Amino acid sequence: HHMIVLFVDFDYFYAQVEEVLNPSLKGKPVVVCVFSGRFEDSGAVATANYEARKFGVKAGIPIVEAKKILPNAVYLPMRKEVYQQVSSRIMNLLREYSEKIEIASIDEAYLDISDKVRDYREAYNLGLEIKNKILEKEKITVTVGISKNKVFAKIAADMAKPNGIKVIDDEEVKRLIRELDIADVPGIGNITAEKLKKLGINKLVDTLSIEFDKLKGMIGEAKAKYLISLARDEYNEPIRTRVRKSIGRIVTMKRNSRNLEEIKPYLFRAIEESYYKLDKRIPKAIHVVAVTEDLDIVSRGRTFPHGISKETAYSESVKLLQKILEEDERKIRRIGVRFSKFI
DNA sequence: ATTGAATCCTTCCCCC
DNA sequence: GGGGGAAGGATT
Ligand SMILES: Nc1ccn([C@H]2C[C@H](O)[C@@H](COP(=O)(O)OP(=O)(O)OP(=O)(O)O)O2)c(=O)n1
Ligand SMILES: *[C@@H]1O[C@@H]2Oc3cc(OC)c4c5c(c(=O)oc4c3[C@@H]2[C@H]1O)C(=O)CC5
Ligand SMILES: [Ca+2]
């Protein structure tokens, strides 16, 4: 009668991988950070286990104000590389419960189990063989979501977490389509959470009050045609294998600068590790982005008829860096690169 | 107040 | 306006 989307989402993943390697931390509040040798203890949180969130230590906030909230808690520099090996291992596992996998991010996969589950009953059934396998061969807990489409399966997971599992039968959908808050619909942030709020929309069903031709100039086609597409219990987007369309790095400079010969070594580092992550792909395009003193991003790109040798990237960055320097007047505080249009 | 990394949607311009 | 290229925008 339709499709069943199974969504797996790792719990406080980054932090949880720190525990799985060093239980000399479980129970205690773990905070995964990122800095730069800037001032010291400067940067932003990446994620924190649940025993640290209760106190106001979520991702995003500067590790600085976090200390004044939990000077007791354990702070760990982030090892993105480590979490990535764990993740590629869990992912490969899921890969054998359905060849119809996606992988929204490093800790999210969407499985299309419509082919191996006659009904939600057996879905939940797989919902658990899975949670257990993952927890067995990785000692990691994951929350699972199940429903008719990728969007709701996610919303599910984000309710059953942590460590949970949940289901949303056509009935609960309609109940959520009229009851779930709006700032909770996957794909909406505070910015769009304002236009919708005051305009006849406080909840997903509200986007049914007003016609798109009035919001299709407030949140723009794709978005509106997407919200409404849901409330109007019509949404049914497929589970396609996501592809990496851009890799790159950006670093943070000790001091803010505008002296091109000072910046260049930074930009080059960014290109080298950036070219490492790039593995064995060949970008035809390339952009240089810089974070000025007042976090206002400025980027400049170039696209070629052919791939970009590393030797040519190094050389093509400066021009893009200079282009920036001339036009924009402010200083530079964060400089990096980003390759695109892969062959 | 710093530090990721990526998507995809949008919006202003050349050009058959 | 359409291909596509380009720089800023708004989530995750
Ligand atoms: N500004 C943001 C917001 C989100 N994300 C990513 C981080 C997560 O890993 C992924 C989203 O997954 P979830 O919100 O479902 O949370 P998870 O439980 O998988 O992640 P977390 O490690 O926070 O528990 O999107 C990101 O990179 N940058
Ligand atoms: C961007 O600046 C901060 O740095 C990071 C780094 C993260 O992961 C490596 C990160 C994550 C999440 C998040 O919400 O924020 C960050 C941030 C901060 C951002 O504001 C997640 O949910 C997972 C990783
Ligand atoms: Ca979580």
Side-chain angles (χ1 to χ4, degrees), chain A residues 11-20 22-32 45-59 70 73-76 162:
Chain A
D11 302 289
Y12 57 104
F13 190 49
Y14 289 173
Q16 186 179 170
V17 198
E18 290 311 351
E19 277 155 21
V20 173
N22 168 7
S24 179
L25 286 166
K26 183 164 273 64
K28 287 164 188 168
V30 167
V31 176
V32 180
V45 177
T47 153
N49 55 34
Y50 292 95
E51 309 82 292
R53 294 198 206 165
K54 311 169 200 149
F55 289 107
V57 181
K58 62 176 185 183
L70 287 187
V74 143
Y75 294 91
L76 311 182

